[PDB]
Structure formats: structure tokens, C-alpha cells
Amino acid sequence: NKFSLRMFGSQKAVEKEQERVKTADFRFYWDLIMLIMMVGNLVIIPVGITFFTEQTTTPWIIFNVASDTVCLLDLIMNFRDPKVIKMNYLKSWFVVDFISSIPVDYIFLIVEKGRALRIVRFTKILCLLRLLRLSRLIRYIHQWEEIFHMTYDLASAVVRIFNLIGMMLLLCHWDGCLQFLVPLLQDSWGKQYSYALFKAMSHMLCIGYGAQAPVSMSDLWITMLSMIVGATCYAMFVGHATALIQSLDSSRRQYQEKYKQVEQYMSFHKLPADMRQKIHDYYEHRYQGKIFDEENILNELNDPLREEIVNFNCRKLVATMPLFANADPNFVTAMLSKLRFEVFQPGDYIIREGAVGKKMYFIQHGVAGVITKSSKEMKLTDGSYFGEICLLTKGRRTASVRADTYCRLYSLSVDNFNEVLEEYPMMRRAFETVAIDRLDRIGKKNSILLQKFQNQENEILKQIVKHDREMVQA
Amino acid sequence: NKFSLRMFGSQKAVEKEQERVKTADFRFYWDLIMLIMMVGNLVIIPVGITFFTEQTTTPWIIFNVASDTVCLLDLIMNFRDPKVIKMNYLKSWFVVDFISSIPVDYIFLIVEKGRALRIVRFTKILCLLRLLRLSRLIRYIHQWEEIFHMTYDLASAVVRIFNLIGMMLLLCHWDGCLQFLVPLLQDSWGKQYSYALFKAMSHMLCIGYGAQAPVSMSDLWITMLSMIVGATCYAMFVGHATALIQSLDSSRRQYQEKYKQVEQYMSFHKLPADMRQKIHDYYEHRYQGKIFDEENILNELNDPLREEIVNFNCRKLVATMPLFANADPNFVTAMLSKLRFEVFQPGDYIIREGAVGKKMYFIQHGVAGVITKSSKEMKLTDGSYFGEICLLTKGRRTASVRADTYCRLYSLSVDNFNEVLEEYPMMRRAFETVAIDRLDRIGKKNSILLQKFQNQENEILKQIVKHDREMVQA
Amino acid sequence: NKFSLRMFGSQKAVEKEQERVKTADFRFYWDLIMLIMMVGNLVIIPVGITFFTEQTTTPWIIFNVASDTVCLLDLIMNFRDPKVIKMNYLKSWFVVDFISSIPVDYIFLIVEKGRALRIVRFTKILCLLRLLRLSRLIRYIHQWEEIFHMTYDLASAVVRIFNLIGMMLLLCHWDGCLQFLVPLLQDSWGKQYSYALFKAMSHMLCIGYGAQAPVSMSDLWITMLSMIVGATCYAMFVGHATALIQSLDSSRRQYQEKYKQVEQYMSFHKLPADMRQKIHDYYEHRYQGKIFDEENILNELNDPLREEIVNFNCRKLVATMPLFANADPNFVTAMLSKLRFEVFQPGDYIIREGAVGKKMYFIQHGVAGVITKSSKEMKLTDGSYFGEICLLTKGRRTASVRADTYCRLYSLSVDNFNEVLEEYPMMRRAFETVAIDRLDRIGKKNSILLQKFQNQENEILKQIVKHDREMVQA
Amino acid sequence: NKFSLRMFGSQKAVEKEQERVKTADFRFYWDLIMLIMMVGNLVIIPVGITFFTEQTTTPWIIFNVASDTVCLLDLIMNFRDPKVIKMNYLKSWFVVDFISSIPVDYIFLIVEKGRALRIVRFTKILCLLRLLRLSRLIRYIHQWEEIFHMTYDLASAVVRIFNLIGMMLLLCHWDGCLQFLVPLLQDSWGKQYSYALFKAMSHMLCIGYGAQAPVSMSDLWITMLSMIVGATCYAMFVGHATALIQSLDSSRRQYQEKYKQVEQYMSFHKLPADMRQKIHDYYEHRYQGKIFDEENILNELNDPLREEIVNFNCRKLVATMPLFANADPNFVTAMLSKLRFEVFQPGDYIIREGAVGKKMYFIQHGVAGVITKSSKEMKLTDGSYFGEICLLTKGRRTASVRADTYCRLYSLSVDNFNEVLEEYPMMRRAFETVAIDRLDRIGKKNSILLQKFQNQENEILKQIVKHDREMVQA
Ligand SMILES: Nc1ncnc2c1ncn2[C@@H]1O[C@@H]2COP(=O)(O)O[C@H]2[C@H]1O
Ligand SMILES: Nc1ncnc2c1ncn2[C@@H]1O[C@@H]2COP(=O)(O)O[C@H]2[C@H]1O
Ligand SMILES: Nc1ncnc2c1ncn2[C@@H]1O[C@@H]2COP(=O)(O)O[C@H]2[C@H]1O
Ligand SMILES: Nc1ncnc2c1ncn2[C@@H]1O[C@@H]2COP(=O)(O)O[C@H]2[C@H]1O
């Protein structure tokens, strides 16, 4: 079944576990059903035994007896190299739970057949054993919520938290049932049940009442346990509600804290108002108000996943310029995997003429204008690259580039560019032809690039150069 | 309109979205107005229907009917490739909201025209549909608060949090309105309204009262919902107030925690009291009691922003000594971008004669005294550099330097200095001339530097050397 | 004794401390016993003095007098280079504590022997001095909990937290004792004690009561201190309960926050549903829902511990293929220490033919299929390595590798592989022989590897190659 | 005065600020005194105006009038390039505060000289202006607590937090004063004041009372503000108390969380019980249960501070073996600065014979035994180094070393050792002589080291070698 694969985590380990079991599950599902039944019975017991004057061989009493027998069978199954482990498990918790899971109803029936009634019904408080089984069961459903990782959809945050607070409300209803039982031991059924539920809600809300003077010491202790259990109800409710609220607020509070650290730095260095506003604008236009570590996220993923994420992010980039389209997938995906993300505001000079360059930019969003002396301006739209001339020649920049609209680029470092272009020689001549044509259009001269640039591959490179020149001619 | 640019985040994407829409906003503003009106109506409904005995065709009843018609029109617009999406949206939430947004007032009027009054007015509880629309609306105003990034000014922390706690107070007033309606269903207008508001405030404050014995099961349930909604009011109020308080608390608590980690380290290594106080003094004199990661902050900004921040920080540095003023902007901005920040206390020996040097220091605040044998002392004030002789010669230091006042310097590493000076050869001879003059003033020997240092550029270098010697002569 | 070793942290420092003491513990155990006795006496004093009308030379009064004498002896011992330190300690806290630890019972007995009774018994409020000693004692048991690092077993989280909340309950019982004493000063023993305990529990639970009008100013102040001490009881209880709850909550909340950051990244880049599901599947199949930093954890451990952890993790890996079994332990443990962990889903192509490789993989879980042209498919099961051909030849990959089941691999980088193989030359010939046989089986040609690969060691290498070919023949 | 240095942060900036002021403090101290007086007056006003039937030209009324005049003078001083700034400051907050700081007592006296009494005394509610000045003052004392950085001693955590909670208690007393004033407007002095304080405390602890039916709308609003201000008192008290508690809790919770992450890793890899216990023992013996990042802490300190910290940590190390004592301070401090800290349990093999070594160990705590074939064992105590032979010869290790007691070592990497020993050639021959003598004692061959090792400096090296051999012989 799927239980073996879920427990092992993979088919290969599940097959080995099955083979080992055969050489030497459904029981888990039966245990889950028994745990649900035991939780229901443990909820009903304070509301059933206290409310009912006597069992009177009721059909619900028969159902409770059947549930107790099922719990005893579950304990026996849990009790069952193997002998020593079974003995240790029995001596650890199983013996105590089995003794505390004695058939109190059957014992009372036998005693009656063979004040005293209240003492006998006090043995029905052995539902605390079912509550201990329910603590094992909440551990189990924690394991199951691990199995249902996030129910495969965290559409509205923790939805299992709704079940947790529902269980807390059920425990608080148990507290109210005990509070109702206290005067029952001290001294219309639907109306009484609703009144008890309302009293439980009021106690959880600490509305206030004039009840006091328990007189009986046992009654005083009963009110003491009622008060402390109501306190635990309040504490659990407030803790879970505050946890949810703090998670919902933290969703933005993480970014708010990071930007508050940024603001602290800006206030230390005392930047002018305009510079502060520009930094704020860049932060909002880059992170969009979200929190992540792109380097860390892509580092902690394996190679194929990072490869496919990067190939998806720049799909329009690889589709737009023909140089990537004609190229083989290996080089394309390597060059993609070595790209980094940057965003430039209008007016920022990405590359200044006469500077020493260290990276190449691919435009994915926006348009950037190349300007230089005596050659007028010309703009590079989406899906085009600039900075190849300095990278190939290893010299000073020839023309300046300026962002005139909010633009999103990917930058390729000099080391990564040289490494990739060395492990794929053909794209070196491709970029050389493109850069020679581009620089001839610009009007400058480049002897080293022409010397370096000096068949079907040649025709493909010429076509790519023509297409790139036509696209950049805008 | 500006809505397209705000949604797309840039003009380039906004234009593409507009072109796509034309090939195939104001509605957003109308939806915002309708959401505000619906929030007002949902606030008024518990206070209006419960308080008023009957609608009686009042002008406010006409306004409520108009608001219901507007909500129905909004639902119809939300309902309206496109057919399948519209059908899915209708089957998901739109159909249920539209059914729950039925004209209860019109239906009641038709029934009256064609105990029963209370049952008919119970259909006005369909304002829960308007409350669901208001949940969509708080999601929308979360989106809008993202649009108004931080209202462009976080002068007094989260100011939107004030609106959030005001909305929480409005919800708690809704709870009080329900609490007032409970005895109205069970069994001077301004005075009654104020009394109800005071009762709501008291319930939120859990002052306490003798109210009990709802008798009616519906009345008991009404008090139950009143209690739980008051509990949610309390939880939301305490959560938001605590978050607000802890923001300001954490503003200083982050630095306190970092320094407590420092103190834990300092206690682990068991440093003396004087060294403990010296470390504390350095921490207070460097970080000024603020938390940031200068390396991380400057790393996560793009190149022009980091360039302008660094060029602003060292403005007095670049302006003060003529070597930077005469130089071209590219070299100046690069070498500034490679500087690091270090603060030295008085008495600390920055550079000891005979040691092997690895960095060069530019003084931005304070004065440091150069001392060595037989040449007396001489002091370097703001805007001057020391450490060039070792960097150029690649040998041992020639004179010792000692901070005599709390000083703030920027240090340039050996690798960065060699890289920058290699990509800009002219400043190599500039620093060589300056260092040769300085060492001739000191009286040591720099034969390697003299050999390395051995037109208009020469005259400019000589003038820079003379100015640097005159400034350092103090 | 073990106290010296526990305080010093090692036997070497303990011996030096013992030698220094001899040249110039059990007292710690006696101080612990005295602190326990003082805590018991400080708990009993509000419940004993207030409840009892007079001491009447009771046996418990004799026990209290003996405890006071023991406390005085402890103070004297604490009072006792050494003279100056003792004087400073006496002038700091010891003198005040000793004065406040005066024998109030003996003084009262002497005064009686030589309204006034209440004034004399007010001197018994000097149990606040024992409470100050108990504050020193809670500091001491914090030190002891550091000595019992985590009791050597954190089986059920902080178990010392149970003792802390028990002490908080004891303090709240002290508050209730003061609340009982308030009307005793203003104006069946077991029943009264239980009633007082119930009143204390109710005050901690803020149930509410009609008690008011203290009339006496001292009575009003007594109720004021009772209220504020109940406030501290409530605050401490809620704080410790919330910390306990949030520990277990954070155990899963840390992973949930990391995956929420991943989800924010995924929502920013707008990946399709299938890609989001694949990323979620990889995250759940790699981290298993746990939080750690394998690099950080293995970095902050010393070399032998990391060595043994890594040697344990790959025990089946080293045992399975004979190449590691025949090898000397040094090379095996080094190459294991340089392995990294990766996990590949089915369908993912680990190595594509024609790509440039930078790492080679060892399979520890799952099976991966080698496929290439004209040679059909063949599957590599657990305990086998692929990718050595590219590493040795320093060329393009020869065959493609595809994961067909969820597989867990360790990868060895190119730099680490070359460094290890250079510091151990024999395994280079071993891998060369194995890879030459493997590539001959594949059907391609490798001249460089054959030239590089061109005694008992040779026979062992041939046997290892035959075994590896037989294992990979599946 | 010291105010200029405190504000500027250094003497150099303070002198420049003083020169600029002279070209164009005590006022700060006067403002502090005025703020303290205004806080006292704002505390007294709810307790003075409400309690007193009329001013009656009392001496305390004269004092209040003087305080109001002082506040007016402070506002005038705050009001006083400079004209525009003063006008902007006046139009921002100063005008409103000055108008609200009108002499209400003088105005009432003039009106009386020239029901109505209550209306006139309602103008004394202008103490809200003093409360706004007190908010400016709490901002100011936040600045002052930044000036008193941690009061120069965080002996018992945040002691300023005690003042903060005292101010919160004062605000809650203000709330109680308003609560007392509410029935005073609706309808033995020490007894009444104590009763009001007790009522304020009871409201703070929400004990509960039968007060209700305000009748008057103004009375109902008064109880409403009283309730909300009491709620703010409760929220501030619980927030500050929880922050205080969680500081001490987090002091150990941070280490507990790090070790819980370690335990999660250990459970993920499923290490045996003995290995888990060994890892726990190493963690407790290395970190001693403390949280820090030695690399980060030493990285964020400047060079002289790190130099002195490291020179202090290894004081016994540098003093013990004579090689460091004879050496010049520069080399000693550099090689100390490049040391790292490690700790080895007994039984761990630090260096195994036949392995390739990459670091050298200096013993600072404990003893490690060198063992090898045919040469028996011999032990290296505190203050001695091993690993020099492999570092100098760049070959395999010659003998194995084993920790037999919990030992603390400093390790010096191969790159750092080669760098330091290259920049200081003399210690190369020193270590060569020592290692040659040591290996001759061992009985192996070091022909390369002997060739490499082949005046006063020679005599010093020989003496150092003899002393090192004598120390190692033990
Ligand atoms: N005339 C042109 N046509 C197309 N691209 C150009 C032209 N002139 C300059 N560029 C690009 O602009 C870049 C600016 O920096 P580089 O000189 O490194 O490389 C340059 C080319 O990539
Ligand atoms: N006579 C001098 N005039 C100016 N600067 C000096 C003089 N002597 C030394 N210095 C500076 O002090 C520095 C000390 O270290 P360096 O030798 O690396 O480089 C030295 C110069 O920068
Ligand atoms: N016939 C074969 N038998 C065993 N292993 C192979 C065979 N063909 C390819 N491989 C392995 O598959 C790997 C794929 O990448 P490499 O060429 O780097 O190295 C290859 C070998 O490790
Ligand atoms: N006879 C000896 N006397 C002192 N030290 C030794 C002796 N033999 C080995 N050692 C030390 O033990 C170290 C073990 O590793 P290395 O060979 O790198 O360097 C060795 C020396 O530092």
C-alpha cells in the first residue's frame, strides 16, 4: 500500500522494507480509526457519565463498552529480539495504560450483580487513560500532518491550525463538563446541556459569577481543577490566536524590519532627502516588498531544478535574440545559470565611456540608450545585450549607456563569461562578429577584436549578426 | 491612468498591458468607493436594524436599498477563455455572495404588500455577506497599502496600524451592537446608543456584570456569540498593541542583543575590566548604537546607487586633497568604492614601524601622529593618507603612526590598491612622487620607489606632491 | 571530588586548582542543602507565622530556630588578599543579610521573658531575608542546571521548566498565604488551609469576589501588595506557559517560515503550478521537514568528530564497492569528508552527454540509468559511482545519466577530486583502469585516459575493476 | 562643557561645532530640569485639581503658576536661515503647544476678579499640553539613555527598564486619579488618597466591582476613558514585564535553540546513541553553553583591538615556550592573530601517521601523547606545538598524536604558516632546527628538512631548540 512508500519516503526503501518484513500499513489505518473513536469517547465520557444518573444498559453504554474493548485490543496489539522489545514496551507504558483501561462498566455491572454507586462510578474516571491514549494520538496526528506535508496546499495559511483550535475548544468543553459535574457530585436535557456549554464559554471568557463557598473539601478541589483547566484553555487559545496573528503580520514585518535596518544605515550616514527617496524607490522597484535570498534559494536547490528555474525565468530572452535560439541547449543553459539579476532606475549610467568594464548586461525589461560622441543616440529594447566589446577586447568601454526607463537586466561577470566562452569556442566567434559589426556601426576602431575574429557555422554567425544589428538599429 | 503604471510597476509593462487590453483602473477606484460604502453599511446594519423597530420607508432605508443595489451591481461586474473563467469565478464564490446579497428589504416589502416581522428581519442578517465582501476589502486594502508602499513616509512608524486598530475598534463596536440586540430580541435614542457603546467598552475591558440567566436557548446562544466576539476583540487589540510596542522596543533590543552576544564572548574568554571597557567604548564609538550590515546593504544595492552613496560619504575626502580633485571621475569613484571603514581609538598604534603592511588609510575624521627615530613627530590632520610607501615598495613600514584622538579612517586593501593602480597607471607615478617627497622629508631610503618613479602631467603631479607635503607639514 | 572537575570543566584544570588550594566542593553541597532548607522555611513562614497564633515553643518552632541558626552559620561562612575580599563582601551584601537574618524568635522570647505581640511577630517578616537568600538560590540552581547541562536527556523538552513553574506555583501560594494573613491582621485547620489555597487559586484565575472596603490603611496596603503579587504570579505563569508552547510551535514554524520564504520567491518569479509542485516535492523529499545547516554544523565541529560522522553516514557506500574496502583508511576518510549531499527526483537528467562536467557522483540511495546512442540502457544501483570519465579526461561527457527513482547521491567536486587524487596517486590508476573498462564496455574511445592508465597493486586494481564492471553490468 | 563632546561623539567634531557656534549644552540641562518639573506637575495636576475644591491662592498653586511660567519660557526659547526655521517650527508644533500652555490659573483668577467654576476648572485640563511636552521628554530621555549608553554597567540587565515601568505605574496612577475625578464631577485627605490609589490598583488588576449606571452622558464617557486608559496600563505593564522575562529566558533559549537544530540534524542522519552523546559532550565542552560567533566578533573589531584580545588569550602560550619570548613582537602578534581555536576529547586522534597534514597545533590546555613505532610514547604538555615537520617538509606525517585528556589547542593553517614564515625568514630556520632535533629524537629521516636547515642568532636558535627538546622530553 501507499503507507510503506509514505513511511520510507521513496519506493526503493519501501521495497526493501517490504522484503525485510516478508523475510521475517493497514494496522496504521486501524489505529487511526481507533484513535478517532477513543477521542470521541473521551470527549463524551465527562458529558455522558456525569450527566447520566446510571448506565442502565443503554445502547450508548453498549457502544462505550465496545469502544473500551477496542481500546483493550489496541493495547494488546501494541504489546505484541521481539520478546525483549515487547517486554520493555510493556514495562514502560503499556502495562500502566492497560491497567488503567480496565472495563470499569463491566466491573461495576459484576459488582452490582454480585454512596457506593458514586464510588463505583468514580472508577469511570479511568477515561484519563483514554486521554493519555489521546495524547499519543495528538503526537500521531502531528506525524500525520507531517505525512500530509501542508495538505499539498497552503492556500489560507495553516488550515490544520483550525483543527488544533477546534480541539482546544473541545478540551475547554471538557472543562465545562467537569464544571457541570462538580455540583452534580456536590448535590430539559438539551436545555441543561446548552446551559452548561454557555457556562463553559463564560468561564473561558472570565465574565464573572457569584459562585463560591464549596463547603465540601472535594467540592473545593473540584472548583480548583476547574479553574486551572479553564486557565489552560485560555492560555492555549490566546497562544494559538497570537501565533496566527503574528505570522500574518510577520508576512510583511520581515520586509519592514529589513527596510528599517536600511533606514538606520541611511540615518547613520546622513544621506540627503533626495538620495533617501531614490534608495527607497529602488528598494520598492526591486524587491517589490517581498523577502527572499535568491542566492541562498538557488544554492539550496539541486542542479536540474535551478537549471529549469533559470531557463524559465529568461524564456523570452532566449527566444528573442537569435544567438541563443541557434545555439545548443548546453551552452545556453550554462550561460543562463551564470546570469545575475539587477534593476536600474532611469537616469542611472550603467556603463560610462572610458571606464574599465567587468560584466555584460542582457536586457529583459525596459530600454537602454547608447550614446557617444558624434554618433548620436540609439536605443536597445527588450532582448538585447551590451558590454560585449569590453569583455572580448579586455579594454576600456567605447560608448556610454544610460537607462531612460525602469529597466531589469541580467549581468554576466567577466570570470563566468570567459569560462563559458572558453568551454564553448564557437560563441566566441559569434560574439566577435556581432561586436565587430556593432562597433563598425558606432564608428570607432578595434584592432584586437578584428584580429581575433579573423562553412555553415560562419553563415549562421553572419545571419545572427545581421539579425542583432537589425534589432539594435532601432 | 496611473493605475496601469502602479499595477505593472513600470511604464514599459503598463504600455504593453494597455496595448493588450486594446487588442482584446477606473473600475478599481469604483470598487474602492463601493467597498468603503459597503464597510459603512455593514457597520451600520447591526446598529440600524436592531435599534430601529421597522424600516418604515425611511430615507436611510432608501440609502441602504441603494447600497444593496450597488453591491449587487458590483457582484454582477465581478461575474462578468473569458466564458470559462467567468463560470469558474461564479461557481467558486460569486454565486454564493450574490445569493446572500439578495434584496432583503425589497423582499420584506413585497411580502408585507402581498413574530413574522422578526423572522423577516432575520433575513437582514444577510449583512454577513457584506461582511464577507469586507473581508475581500481588507485583503484589497492590504494590496493598497502595498501600493502606498509606506505612504512614502514612515515618520511615526506604521500609521496604517492606527487604521487597523480603528477597524478593530469598529468590529468591537459591532460586537457591542450585537450585545445590545440580544435583549432586544429577548424582549433618548442618543442616551441608549451611548449606553450601548459604554457596555461594549466594558465588555472589551471585562469589568464584570451580574447579567445571567438568558432563559431562552436563542438568548443563551446570542450571549455565547457575544462573548466569543468580545474575546476576539480583546485578542486582536492586545496583539496589535503588543506588536506596536515591540517594534519600538526591538529598535533598541536588536543592538542590545548583539552587544549581549559580544558580552557573552567577552566573559567566555575572561578579559580584564579595562579591556572590557575599551571594547565597549569602541563599540559605542563605531556603531553609535545602531544595527546594520554595511557590506550586505551595499551589496544588495545596484552599482550606480552604491557608487553615489560612496561618492557622497567621501565628499570631503575627495575635495580636500588635490590628488583626487585633479583625477578623472572614473578612478576616483572606483577607488572610493573599494574603501572600507575603520575607527581607531586614541593610543592605538595603527601602523608599527618594521611590520609588513597590507592596507592604506585615508583620514576622514581626526588626526594621527607619525613618529619615528631622530625625526621628531609630525601630525596628519583630516583629509590625508598614510601607508602608500609600503604599498608601492612592497616592503616593511618605515615610520610608526599613532592615533591621538578618536579617528575615523577608510582603509584600502593591498589587492584593491594594486588592481586600481594597475588599471590606472598615472596615479602610480602620482603616488610615487608624493611618497618619494614624503620619505625624503622623513629621511629614510626608498631606492626601489625612487627607481620606479624615475609634460603637463608631470607638472600636475609635482603640484599635487607640493600641496600634499604642505598639508602634511603641520 | 567531582565538584572540582565540574567547576574547572576538565581534569587538567581541576588538578591545578586542587594544587593551588593545597598550596594556599563539599561546602557547595552543604550550601545546596541549606538553600533547600531555607526555601522550605521561606515557603512555610507565611503559612506558619500567620496561621499560628503563637510559637508556644512548638517542635516546628524549634525546627525553625535551627534553620535560622543554620542560615546564620551559612552567612558567617560566606563572610569568611583574603581580608580585603572578605571585608568587601561583608560591606556589599553580607552585612545586610546577616542583620536581616537576626533570630527574631529568640529576640521575641527574650523580650517576653524580660498589640505588642503583633508588633513583635512583625519582626518575623524578616523571612524576606530568607527570600533574598532564595533569590541567590535560584541563581545558584540556574548555575546547577548549567552543571546538569540538559540533565543529559532532553527527552520531553525542558523538564527543568516544570520545576520552574512549580516554583512559580509555590510563589503564588505564598501570595495566597499573604492574602489569608491580611484579614488575620485586620481581625478545622485543614479546612481553613484548603479554603485559603482555593482562594489563592481563584485570585490567580481572577474569578472575582465582592471583597472590598479594607477600612484600615494597613489593610488597604495589604490588599494592594496581594493584588500586585497575584499580578506577578499571573504574568510569570502566562510567560512560562507561552514560552513552552512556542518552543514546540517553533519546532515546525522554522521550517514553515523557510518554505514561506521559498513561496514568496516562487510567487515573485511567477512559476507555473507544475514547477511549484515539483519544487515543493523536492523540498519535502530532501529536508524531510527539518531545519539545519549541514555546512554550518559540520564546520563548527572539530576534525575527528566530522570525520567519524561522515564515515558513519557513508558506511554502506564504503562497504559496498571494493575500491573503498581495499583502500587505506586515510584516503577513504578524506574523500568521504569532501563529499556533498544531493537528491534527484525521477526524470531529472543528472548528466547530459556533450556537457562539460565539474563533479562526479556516488549513489547511496536509488538507481540511475545510463543511456546513450546504440548501446541501449543500463542501470547503476546503490553503491556505485558515475562521472569519473570526465573528471579524469577533463573533457566532455560521454553518456547521459537519468534518475528514474527518487535518488540520494553524494557528489565530489572537480577541485576536491583532483586534490585528493594528487595526494594519493594509486587511486588515480585505480579509477583509470575502472573507467577504461567502463568506456570500452560503452563503445566509445578515450585516448587520453588510456595513455594515462598506461605487481600486487596491479592485480588488486584489476580485481576491483572486474568487481565494479560486474556490479554495473546490471 | 562635556555636552558638546557627548553630542558630537568626539573632541575633533566638538571643537569644530564650538568654532562654528562662535562664528555665528547648559540649555540642554535647563531643559532637562524643566522636563522633570513638567513631568511632576503633569502627575500632580489630575491629583491636585480634582482633589482640591479650589486653588484658593495656595502656596502649591503659586508653585504650579511658576511651573506654568517656566513651561511658557521653555516654549518661547524653543520658538527662538534662522527666521525661516523658527517660523516653520512655530507653525509645526510650537504654536499649538504654546496656545495649549495658556495660564489657565491666571485666566481663571482674572475672570473671577472681573457651575461656572467647574467650566473654568475644565480649562485646567490643559495639562494635556504638559503631557505632550512629557512625550517630547520621554523621547528626550530615550536620547539621554543613548547618551548614558548602558549606564556604563549592565550589571542587572536593563535598569532603565525599572524607570520605564515606574513611569508606567505613574501613568496608571494618573488613570486612577481620573477614575477618582469621575464621581467628583458626577457629584481624611490621606485616607481618601490611599483609597483612590487602592481603587487604581484594583482597576489595574481587574478585580471587579459593582459600579455601573453612570446616568450622566459625561459620566459615561468618563468611565469609558477610565476603562481604556486602564487597558493601556495593563497592556504596557504586561508588555514590559514579558520583555524583561524573555530577555533572561532567551539568554539560554538561544543556545537551546542552536542545540535543538543540532539535534534535528543528528536525528535526520540517525546517528547511534554513543555518537550523539559524544557530540553533546563536545558541544558542552567547547561552547560551555554560550552563544557567540568568534569569527564574526573578531571580524567586526578593528585591528588593534583584535590584536590585543588575541595577544591576551595566548599570554601563557607566548610566555611558555622560549621561541615566542625571544621573537620580536610583530611576528608573535601576527602568528597569534592567525591562530584558530579547537578542542579535542580524549581518545581522538588529532594527527594520524601517514596522512597528509594541513595545519599545526599549539597546546594551550591539556596534554597530548605522541606515539609511533619502536620509539615508545612521549607526552607533550601545555605550551608546546606539534605538526611543524609536515608543514616544513610538505610531506606525510611521521608520528601519530592522540589526545588523552580534554585538550584545548590552537591550530595554524598551512597557508597562514607559509605566509607568516615567508614574511619572517628567521623563524623558518628556528622551526627547522627544532624539528630536526625532534625528528632525530624520534628516529626517522628528514633529509629535505635537514638540507633546508643547512652568530648570535644561531646561538639563540640553538638555545631555543634545546629548551623545546627539554620541554617535549617530559
Ligand atoms: N553602434 C552600436 N550599435 C550597437 N551596439 C553598440 C554600438 N555602440 C556601442 N554599442 C554597445 O554598447 C556597449 C557599451 O560598452 P562596450 O564598449 O563594452 O560595448 C558596447 C556595445 O555592446
Ligand atoms: N616625513 C613624512 N612626511 C609625510 N608622511 C610620512 C613621513 N614619514 C612617514 N610618513 C607616512 O607614514 C607612513 C607609515 O607607514 P608607511 O611607511 O607604509 O608609509 C608612511 C607614509 O605614508
Ligand atoms: N558502459 C558503461 N559502463 C559503466 N559506466 C558507464 C558506461 N558508460 C558510461 N558510464 C558512466 O556514465 C558516466 C556519464 O558521464 P561521464 O562520461 O563523465 O562518465 C560516465 C561513466 O561513469
Ligand atoms: N621525538 C619527538 N619529539 C618531539 N616531537 C615529536 C617527536 N616525534 C614527532 N613529534 C611531533 O609529532 C608530530 C606529528 O606530526 P608531524 O610529523 O607533522 O610533526 C611531528 C612533531 O611535531
Author numbering:
A (entry chain D), B (entry chain A), C (entry chain C), D (entry chain B): 107 to 130, 140 to 195, 209 to 242, 252 to 324, 340 to 606, 616 to 635
Q: Can I see the authors' text?
A:
Hyperpolarization and cyclic nucleotide (HCN) activated ion channels are critical for the automaticity of action potentials in pacemaking and rhythmic electrical circuits in the human body. Unlike most voltage-gated ion channels, the HCN and related plant ion channels activate upon membrane hyperpolarization. Here, we present cryo-electron microscopy structures of human HCN1 corresponding to Closed, Open, and a putative Intermediate state.
We found that HCN1-F186C-S264C mutant in a mixture of 0.0025% LMNG, soy polar lipids, and cholesterol hemi-succinate elutes primarily as a monodisperse peak. This fraction was collected, and its structure was determined in the presence of Hg2+ to a global resolution of 3.6 Å using single-particle cryo-EM. Thus, we conclude that the Open channel conformation is primarily facilitated by oxidizing conditions that trap the voltage sensors in a hyperpolarized conformation. In the Open state, the R4 charge moves past this position by a complete helical turn and the S4 helix retains its mid-helical bend in the Open state. Another unique feature is that the intracellular end of the S4 helix unwinds and shortens by about two helical turns in the Open-state structure. Notably, the selectivity filter in the Open state undergoes conformational rearrangement simultaneously with gating transitions at the pore gates, leading to pore expansion in the selectivity filter. Upon further examination of the cryo-EM densities, we discovered that C309 in the S5 helix and C385 in S6 likely form a disulfide bridge in the Open but not in the Closed state. Concomitant with these structural changes in the S4 and S5 helices, the residues in this region make extensive contact with the B’ helix of the C-linker region in the Open state. All-atom simulations of ion permeation through the Open-state structure in a lipid bilayer with an applied voltage clearly show that this channel pore is conducting.
